[PDB]
Design a protein around this ligand. Sequence first.
Ligand SMILES: Nc1ncnc2c1ncn2[C@@H]1O[C@H](COP(=O)(O)OP(=O)(O)O)[C@@H](O)[C@H]1O
Lengths: 445, 135, 133
Amino acid sequence: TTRLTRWLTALDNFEAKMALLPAVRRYGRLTRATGLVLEATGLQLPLGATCIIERQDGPETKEVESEVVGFNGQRLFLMPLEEVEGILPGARVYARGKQLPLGPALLGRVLDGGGKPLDGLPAPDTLETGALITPPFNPLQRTPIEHVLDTGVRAINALLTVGRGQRMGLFAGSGVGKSVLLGMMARYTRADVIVVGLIGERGREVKDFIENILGPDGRARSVVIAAPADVSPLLRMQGAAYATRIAEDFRDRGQHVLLIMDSLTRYAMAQREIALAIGEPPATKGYPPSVFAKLPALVERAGNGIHGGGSITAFYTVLTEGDDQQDPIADSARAILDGHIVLSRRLAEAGHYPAIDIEASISRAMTALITEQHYARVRLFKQLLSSFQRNRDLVSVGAYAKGSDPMLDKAITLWPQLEAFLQQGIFERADWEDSLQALDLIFPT
Amino acid sequence: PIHARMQQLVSEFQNTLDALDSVIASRLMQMALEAARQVIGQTPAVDNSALIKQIQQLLQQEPLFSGKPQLRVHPDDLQRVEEMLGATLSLHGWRLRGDPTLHHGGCKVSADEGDLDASVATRWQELCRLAAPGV
Amino acid sequence: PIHARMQQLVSEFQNTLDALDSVIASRLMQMALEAARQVIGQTPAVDNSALIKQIQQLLQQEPLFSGKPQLRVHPDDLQRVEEMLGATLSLHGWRLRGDPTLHHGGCKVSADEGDLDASVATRWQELCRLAAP
Ligand SMILES: Nc1ncnc2c1ncn2[C@@H]1O[C@H](COP(=O)(O)OP(=O)(O)O)[C@@H](O)[C@H]1O
């Protein structure tokens, strides 16, 4: 009756949920649809409230999901998650904490912001749910960063070092191997669980990422929340929202998670659509003020948990589009983040992968995580690097000869090894040791 | 070798059964629900005791409808409710109608602004959801 | 060995399905009554003997409870399983099949609906008689 008791219990727990059911349901009325944003009246609700609009199918009464993005004190401004075609003037409206599936059940699965399966499999067995909205973890009661997080990417581990709970940026552009780099980490990063939020990414690229990048290797240790570019911006934000919530829970179980948010640009861009629809002027770049209230909020959720706890180490991709730094999101990203991995277009077009700008990149937690003997080696690596890329031309003409410049001389002697050290490959893993020991084969000891 | 993938099936077989535990329990709930569904439809009853209490609650629920509010109950609950609360309704300015499609022991209040839905029809939907968060 | 485990699975599982018949009717009634009550707002007046009969019928309508489980596996591991669980499965009346779709070294459990001729032959004895109002 081990199994039998499970069943009876399952049943018993439902009968107790009956007590809860609402005696009465209040309806409002949809007053106006002239545009994407709808106006309803008769029920008063908080922002973010999920509001249902009733559409008559004939004998069937279908429900159109909708959400509260604003109001005039008497009117409620709703935005739809789907098409309102077939809704009647003065249609009925009502409000339905929304529970979402959380747990080891999610591993190996592909879900949307709603929590619905995208892999063509049944909903996960939901023993536990949660709410998107969770009281923000108080950083007062969390723990500092003492531990290197092995990212399995040699250049990062050795040159830009990250550690558990650190929240890092990834700045890049189309075609520099961003998607792959993330895959490599999702596969090689040493962590208990990998959460990958894919927000605003193209539909077909989401499939490419899951089938051919993450692989079965990393697909199995990963939970993938996907809100593509076709859906409503509300659903994209939910995607990042749900992705973070999951990782948060997993953290509360003592797990160490890698949280990949692709992308923070899209999250932001999704808020902009919504903000503009409700008539919030574009104050900063033509990006409304809310966009910059949002990014901090979503990023602060990541971090290390209670001591002897578990953690969320994150990577928020920012798409730096064309030669840039004009972009405010990339700035807001820089301001709220622990440092960033910068992908070089020049390197990518040179076949140098992953194309990571050791100059542009930084990790502020690095010096705290490594030995001064190591940290010395680090600086040198960059200086040698920098020496080479500025003067790389003259060497070709045969212009340079030894004795004039100590760095460029050393650097150019080490170049094939440096170049080889920075380069990794899609299936090539570099552990913590592998990376460190690789450093010695060059300089020390 | 044998032990390698002959255990595969063992634990694959274990997982499959565990998978049904929630499906099978749920299936069992569905059986009781259909029965419940049957008894509800099966019977009328002469006690508005609970219905009369809900209407009392509705009358005092805020915000108040100015929209020419009308309370509707099944013609079978109608005469009795009309007597008990029919004075109070008029005091609140509500009017009463029979609605053939409401089940006994439940009601709806309708105004221009919106509705207070006390129908057992909607309470059933609410119920089924509690049982199947999928729907 | 694994033998005990898989046999105890089939053992335990089927056994649990069996226990349902004796203990599950009254349980589903108590629930049916709660549901009704919470929806209507008061305890209705219902014939218990009538109602408890309605549930048994509802139960007889689920092949998993009325019939036996069907364990279908991958054709490749088909022979392997039947050698291991063949004796234990037969005892409990479980059919077994290969499923082309299932992945190598994998298993799926469904409730078998048997044969059409059997299902029909059974209905006649039930349909043969009619009660009175
Ligand atoms: N480590 C690597 N080894 C070999 N080729 C790589 C490596 N990283 C990236 N590439 C090449 O760069 C491209 C990266 O594409 P992708 O990462 O999907 O673009 P995006 O930068 O938009 O994510 C691939 O087509 C691949 O051929």
